[PDB]
């Protein structure tokens, strides 16, 4: 196991097979695969110089037109990640850990539900826009501070729940129009729109050269265990690689901070963008440092994250 891990950390083309091996059943969409691969492992959350914990996790949300392969990732995470709870979203307090009574003392206990079931994992919510207002403000109360609060029968109890929301949303009309902004098309309020590190917009049209390849891949997949789907390496070493990169704990330098202030100015020159998107790209930097297994981070690997933010 360590003979496979030391062989896999000494090469140079690991990340390029990792972005095409995190979802081998999906044709195209390297940016969505990049965010899904960097959304499994987080970083630098630890402790603030004062005494309060910060949001060191990566929030990933996918949007686009109907009949795409964006739910396939949703079906992959839950079939591969052990710390992964999937919910239908439309058919959903439960999300933010509901309260149920016990008759001994007529006392309450807090069921995790979708929100607290996973620990250092990915909670994936399909159909995020057909949910109500109560579970979405419970998600917002669970997201401002990495904790969830339950107030019932006179007692108040809050607890540390760490989750990475994988939100699958759709527009109000389904078809994504390039006419306006993301806010009027997503149809949800600003606060619940905030604390999200990366948005993935997928638009489709008639482009025959990649479309014929996609349809051929779909009809070639429809057979008994085809080799077409096959990745460059299996998940057997990828699980221990995820765990080995998880126990690494890397840190930033001065050149990265000097390039980061100019990158935040470049992201704010496009203008909403505030401190939360800066925190999202800071948290994605140590995740890509852990994925490439480099300790002290250089700004050239943060340049790919800058290009990923520019691509969105």
């Amino acid at each position: 196991e360590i003979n496979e891990l030391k062989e896999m950390v000494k090469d140079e083309h690991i990340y390029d097979k990792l972005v095409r091996s995190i979802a081998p059943a999906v044709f195209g969409h390297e940016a969505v695969k990049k965010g899904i691969l960097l959304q499994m492992l987080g970083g630098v959350h630890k402790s603030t110089v004062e005494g309060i914990k910060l949001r060191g996790d990566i929030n990933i949300c996918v949007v686009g037109d109907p009949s795409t392969s964006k739910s396939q990732f949703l079906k992959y995470v839950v079939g591969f990640a052990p710390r992964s709870v999937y919910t239908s979203g439309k058919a959903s307090a439960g999300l933010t850990a509901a309260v149920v009574r016990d008759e001994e003392g007529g006392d309450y206990t807090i069921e995790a539900g979708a929100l607290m079931l996973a620990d250092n994992g990915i909670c994936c919510i399909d159909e995020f826009d057909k949910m109500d207002i109560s579970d979405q403000v419970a998600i917002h109360e669970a997201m401002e501070q990495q904790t969830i609060s339950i107030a019932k029968a006179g007692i108040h109890a809050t607890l540390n729940a760490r989750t990475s929301i994988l939100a699958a949303a759709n527009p109000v009309g389904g078809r994504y129009n390039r006419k306006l902004s993301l806010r009027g098309n997503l149809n949800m309020t600003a606060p619940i729109m905030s604390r999200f590190d990366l948005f993935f917009v997928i638009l489709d049209d008639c482009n025959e050269k990649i479309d014929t390849e996609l349809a051929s891949h779909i009809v070639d997949l429809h057979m008994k265990r085809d080799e077409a789907i096959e990745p460059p390496f299996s998940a057997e070493q990828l699980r221990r690689y995820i765990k080995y990169a998880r126990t690494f704990k890397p840190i930033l330098t001065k050149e990265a901070r000097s390039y980061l202030v100019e990158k935040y100015k470049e992201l704010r020159k496009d203008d909403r963008i505030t401190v939360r998107q800066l925190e999202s790209m800071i948290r994605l930097s140590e995740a890509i440092a852990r994925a490439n297994c480099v300790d002290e981070i250089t700004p050239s690997f943060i340049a790919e994250a800058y290009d990923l933010l520019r691509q969105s």
Binding site: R178, D205, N207, K209
Partner: protein
């Protein structure tokens, strides 16, 4: 082939002096006897002739433009698809153009031009008739109707250059069929 190409003239024109026009250079371009007989045997000159009669109505207008002039017009239709009448200002073009540019570099080195220079490219585009003014009756029929339009002081000149509401001559969806896929802006023809 001569009998083949006469069939085409029967189809679209069905008029003899159109075809009669084509033969006049074909029989004067020969210099010896035997070349002329091959010319009416080949009729390849009729291809070159129908090439030249076609070469700058609308398509060869489009093929004979540089990289920027395509890129302005490609943005000019993607604004034009949004509004209901299809009209679009110069600021909506430029803004759209800038947004389009802010996508090519981020997916990879292309000189984004200024404001003060696109006007020089915008001048040729309106006199290449790829755009029209919104309410502009082009040619009057007779003299005294044109003379009644000359005395009339206009309002569109009284709003500035960058706000004359220019509309579209060549629609966005038809650009995809003519622009080859080898060009980088082919992803922008379709929305």
């Amino acid at each position: 082939n001569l009998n083949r190409h006469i069939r085409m003239n029967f189809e679209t024109f069905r008029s003899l002096p159109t075809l009669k026009n084509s033969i006049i250079p074909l029989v004067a371009t020969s210099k010896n006897f035997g070349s002329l007989c091959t010319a009416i045997k080949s009729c390849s000159f009729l291809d070159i002739y129908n090439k030249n009669q076609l070469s700058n109505n609308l398509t060869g207008r489009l093929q004979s433009l540089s990289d920027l002039e395509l890129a302005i017009l490609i943005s000019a239709a993607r604004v034009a698809l949004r509004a209901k009448d299809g009209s679009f200002n110069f600021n909506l073009a430029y803004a759209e153009y800038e947004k389009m540019i802010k996508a090519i570099n981020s997916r990879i080195t292309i000189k984004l031009w200024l404001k003060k220079d696109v006007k020089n490219v915008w001048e040729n585009l309106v006199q290449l008739d790829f755009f029209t003014e919104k309410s502009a009756v082009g040619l009057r029929d007779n003299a005294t109707a044109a003379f009644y339009a000359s005395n009339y002081q206009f309002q569109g000149t009284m709003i500035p250059f960058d706000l004359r509401s220019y509309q579209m001559q060549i629609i966005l969806q038809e650009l995809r069929r003519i622009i080859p896929k080898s060009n980088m802006y082919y992803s922008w023809t379709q929305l």
